[PDB]
Amino acid sequence: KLSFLQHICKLTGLSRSELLRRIVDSPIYPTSRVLGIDLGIKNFSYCFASQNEDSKVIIHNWSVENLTEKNGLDIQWTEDFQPSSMADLSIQLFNTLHEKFNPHVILMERQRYEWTLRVNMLESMLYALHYAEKRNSIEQKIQYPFLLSLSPKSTYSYWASVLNSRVQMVKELIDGQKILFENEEALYKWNNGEFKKDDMADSALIASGWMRWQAQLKHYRNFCKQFL
Amino acid sequence: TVKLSFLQHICKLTGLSRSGRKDELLRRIVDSPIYPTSRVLGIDLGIKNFSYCFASQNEDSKVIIHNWSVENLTEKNGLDIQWTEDFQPSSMADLSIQLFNTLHEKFNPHVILMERQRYRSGIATIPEWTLRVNMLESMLYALHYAEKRNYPFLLSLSPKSTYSYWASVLNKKSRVQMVKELIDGQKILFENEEALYKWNNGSRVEFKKDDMADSALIASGWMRWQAQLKHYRNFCKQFL
Fold first, then answer.
1. B135-160 burial, b for 16+ CB within 10 Å, e for fewer?
2. Which of B97-103's residues contact partners 24+ apart within 8 Å by CB, and which partners?
3. Are B107 and B39 in contact (CB under 8 A)?
4. How far apart, in whole angstroms, are the C-alpha atoms of residue A1 and residue A5?
5. Which residues of B touch A83 (CB under 8 A)?
6. Number of H helices, E strands in chain A
7. Which of A155, A179, A190, B223 is the most exposed place for a label (fewest CB within 10 A)?
8. Which member of A82, A110, A129 has the closest CB to residue B142?
9. What is the CATH number of domain A1-228?
10. How many residue pairs bridge chain A and chain B with CB atoms within 8 Å of each other?
11. Is B154 helix (H, G, I), strand (E, B) or coil?
12. Nearest CA to B78 among B111, B112, B41, B52?
């Protein structure tokens, strides 16, 4: 049924574009050491997590950082949006994320339309740094982390549909035991913590959502194969 | 008597900021960094009209053009860049990387001057153009500074400084006319006939001459600023 295949795409974050090819050919990405990122400069948000056997999300680190001041990432940068200055921030951030998390997968939402231009610059530089390394890893037959660019608010709209606010959905997933914590530190900051609790909810939704798509794909990838 | 207006004039003649106090301008001039004037690669950021001018400053303080061209990175071009139009973050990184390597291997510059090409409503919409050029610039910068840590100077210039400079020095006059004057006045010479040929012959097509003139004014304009600075730095110290 065409309608059925459309429902699968909506559940796996796939394009409702036949659909059998898109579903079956969907890359099987790693589900451990997943770094979900909601880009920002004074409010950089990331959620580092892994998917366990019970297909539950286990958060290792989760925080919102103001890259302009002292922060948990230890990035020392003076607010200056000139290209050369931004490149410095990009390199520091890029190096720090890998050095600190050694991710298998990096998730990032493309964003949409002066604060947008600044974030877009940071985003573009991170992409360039990443792809220069990915190319090198390909030619050397070395496995390198994946940087997946997700459509604007894709994971948000996905969760909003399965659960019918952002903070509310996250709390629900937490009380629903869909999201666990390896360290108390992350859970505490979520319960107390100055930084917007909304920015924190964004990175968790990105990671948990994407991981849900990979879990779902494992339910229909093989199933759909038989219809080819 | 060290008038403020005179210092502002010097700033315009050296491509420096004209804003500040009568003692800020002095320091700006005197403290302006010293950069090489040989193997200067001027780049006008654009995708379908990427323009560049590679030149060096002569002993006679004359600008010598080595390579000069305007390319459409979407079709077959002189930079030998095979790229399919796609403004997706991953596709742009691909273009930025080729453009980055191709410019370093082909010109091996001592200095790279970057400026955004002048917007034209015919090329694309404001949103699309803004995103495309901002992305290109951003990626090229990241690649440059990443490589650097692993060294050619990379400098962003304001179109205002470039144009403002030539307007006061030559004047009304179009960019093409300014360059034509510079050439006819022997202020800009050519190392090889190829470049000179593109300029004289290439007059057809969409704003080819205009785009080439743009990058030529960027490079030659900046090289002259550095020349004037070799004179004005010591001169301005007098008031310190």
1. bbbbbbbbbbbbeeeeebebbebeee
2. B97/A128, B97/A131, B97/A132, B97/A135, B97/B139, B97/B143, B99/B50, B99/B73, B99/B136, B99/B140, B100/B140, B100/B143, B100/B144, B103/B41, B103/B43, B103/B52, B103/B79
3. yes
4. 7
5. 114, 137-138, 141, 156
6. 8, 6
7. A190
8. A129
9. 3.30.420.10
10. 76
11. strand
12. B52
What resolution does the deposited structure have, in angstroms? Answer: 2.3
Dist. CA A16–CA A13, nearest whole Å: 9
Give the pair of three-digit tokens for residue B122: 């015919």
Query: What determination technique applies here?
Result: X-ray
- In this structure, are strands A57-65 and A179-181 parallel, antiparallel, or unpaired? parallel
Contacts of B90 in chain A (CB under 8 A): 127, 131, 149
CATH of segment(s) B1-240: 3.30.420.10
Using beta carbons and an 8 Å cutoff, which residues of B are at the interface with A?
A: 88-90, 92-94, 96-97, 114, 127, 130-131, 134-135, 137-146, 149, 154, 156
B139–A127 CB contact, under 8 Å:
yes
